[PDB]
Design a protein that fits this description.
With 448 residues, the chain is of the alpha/beta class. It has two domains: 1-354, TIM Barrel (Alpha-Beta Barrel); 355-447, Immunoglobulin-like. Helix content is 23%, strand content 19%. The protein has nine helices and 22 strands. The protein has helices at 13-27, 64-76, 124-129, 131-136, 150-166, 181-188, 223-235, 282-293, 340-350, and strands at residues 5-8, 31-34, 80-86, 89-90, 95-96, 102-103, 143-144, 170-174, 196-199, 219-221, 256-258, 298-303, 321-322, 325-326, 359-363, 368-372, 377-382, 391-393, 399-402, 420-423, 428-430, 437-442. Strand 10, helix 7 (223-235) and strand 11 (256-258) form a beta-alpha-beta unit. Helix 1 (13-27) packs parallel to helix 2 (64-76) and helix 5 packs across helix 6. The longest helix is centred in the middle third of the chain and has 17 residues, at 150-166. The radius of gyration is 22 Å and the shape is globular. The structure holds calcium ion (CA) and chloride ion (2 copies). One chloride ion binds at residues 14, 18. One chloride ion is lined by residues 200, 221, 262. Monomer. Ca(2+) binds at residues 88, 135, 144, 178. Belongs to the glycosyl hydrolase 13 family. The active site is at 174 (nucleophile), 200 (proton donor). Substrate binds at residues 47-51, 89, 172, 177-178, 207, 264, 269.
Length: 448
């Protein structure tokens, strides 16, 4: 069952289509979040994608034709597409868009100065004591659209509805905190059907605007998950995760979009250094294994590129699928969604979707944990400097299982590609996990 989606950060339409047919679809990924496909300002910086000029499908990722082809191809492979939608603003300054359109002085092909909120700057302290300035003033100088305007609403809605007609099944509302929740409601009233919608709202607490205000318009990004998970894995005890989720003050599980990191906090935006990224290697594997195994929220695996200490830089100069050569894992695209442990985690979540409970939780009071998903699957993570050899209780049928984190079951289910885990007649497992390693098994990866 589909349970996880991925963000192919800066991946062009051609790369996404191939990635859907060759890996994402076969591995069970539910969807792919693409970078803004609408016309935006010129420049190699990744953030240019967040400064719109018009809603024409002409961007760094490709043209409209290529965009459509990507939607059809992914759909055919069983993978949905979520479009990152800029519902809060338009580009700053002036210039020409990726489609040739000119803009300046808050004048755009589809917007005039009157369709924007009077200019003012959002100041740090505004987040804490001034709701008005947060949703009416400019975010980093970006022209703040008057989202209360019926015209603006119709324009953004027509954009979303048109994308749905093409086949887009979901949308990410960018900078949703900077847009009044009631404004988003009026917007959703103009949206056809009921597509998947998740709103980006960074709320670590103590904000004038709270994430909970957006629970009626769609899913909401739970940034506490990324920060708290990273802080615990780096500086705390995994044993504290026994009640992760609402127990830590997070939003309801059925409303949250979670992740280990995102393109923003992996480079200092909305997240401190405690956030875990691909740069932390095995630490990243483990955090992902936890997130994917734990039954909280709708997880989005991050897929990035090595920006070489340059937080402004755009992606690699070569595509992912470059003439038969996969530009992954090196100094270009990281392709974390292909990392054995991460992809294995997705397989686990997909096969435990029939039991969203945490059963038989065990820990060594510190950095060793194990828990299951009823009789559907079991897992364990060892982050101590000594081997984890504890015997844990599980609800799984006795037999031999593939550690889906290190391999997979064969076609004839007669063998595994990775290590084998045994469940004794009493349903217990005699763990043997080295330092900084883990294991995960499920009912659909049992040896025949
Ligand atoms: Ca706004
Ligand atoms: Cl192709
Ligand atoms: Cl996000």
């Amino acid at each position: 069952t589909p349970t996880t989606f991925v963000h192919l950060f800066e991946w062009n339409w051609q790369d996404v289509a191939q990635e859907c047919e060759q890996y994402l679809g076969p591995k069970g990924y539910a969807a792919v979040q693409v970078s803004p496909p609408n016309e935006h300002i010129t420049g190699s910086q990744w953030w240019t994608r967040y400064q719109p000029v018009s809603y024409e499908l002409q961007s760094r990722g490709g043209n409209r034709a290529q965009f459509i082809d990507m939607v059809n191809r992914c759909s055919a492979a069983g993978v949905d597409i979520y479009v990152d939608t800029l519902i809060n603003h338009m580009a700053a300054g002036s210039g020409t868009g990726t489609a040739g359109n000119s803009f300046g002085n808050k004048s755009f092909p589809i917007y005039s100065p009157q369709d924007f909120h009077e200019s003012c700057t959002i100041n740090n302290s505004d987040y804490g004591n001034d709701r008005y300035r947060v949703q009416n003033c400019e975010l980093v100088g970006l022209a703040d659209l008057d989202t209360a305007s019926n015209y603006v609403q119709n324009t953004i809605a027509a954009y979303i509805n048109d994308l749905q007609a093409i086949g887009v099944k979901g949308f990410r509302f960018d900078a949703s905190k900077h847009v009044a929740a009631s404004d988003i409601q009026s917007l959703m009233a103009k949206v056809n059907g009921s597509p998947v919608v998740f709103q980006e709202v960074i709320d670590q607490g103590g904000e004038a605007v709270g994430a909970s205000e957006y629970l009626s318009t769609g899913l909401v990004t739970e940034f506490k998950y990324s920060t708290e998970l990273g802080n615990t894995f780096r500086n705390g005890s995994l044993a504290w995760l026994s009640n992760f989720g609402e127990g830590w003050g997070f939003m309801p599980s059925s409303s949250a979009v979670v992740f280990v990191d995102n393109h923003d906090n992996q480079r200092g935006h909305g997240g401190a250094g405690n956030v875990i990224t691909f740069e932390d290697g095995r630490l990243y594997d483990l955090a992902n294994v936890f997130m994917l195994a734990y039954p909280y929220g709708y997880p989005r695996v991050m897929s990035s590129y090595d920006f070489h200490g340059d937080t402004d830089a755009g992606g690699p100069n070569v595509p992912v699928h470059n003439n038969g050569n996969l530009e992954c894992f090196a100094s270009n695209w990281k392709c974390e969604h292909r990392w054995s442990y991460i992809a294995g985690g997705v397989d686990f979540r997909n096969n435990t979707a029939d039991n969203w409970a945490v059963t038989n939780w065990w820990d060594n009071t510190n950095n060793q944990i194990s828990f299951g998903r009823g009789s559907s699957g079991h897992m364990a993570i060892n982050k101590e400097d000594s081997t984890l050899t504890a015997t844990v209780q599980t609800d799984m049928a006795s037999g031999q299982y593939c550690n889906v984190l290190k391999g997979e079951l064969s076609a004839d289910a007669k063998s595994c590609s990775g290590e084998v885990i045994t469940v004794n007649s009493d349903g217990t497992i005699n763990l043997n996990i080295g330092a900084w390693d883990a294991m995960a098994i499920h009912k659909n990866a049992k040896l025949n």
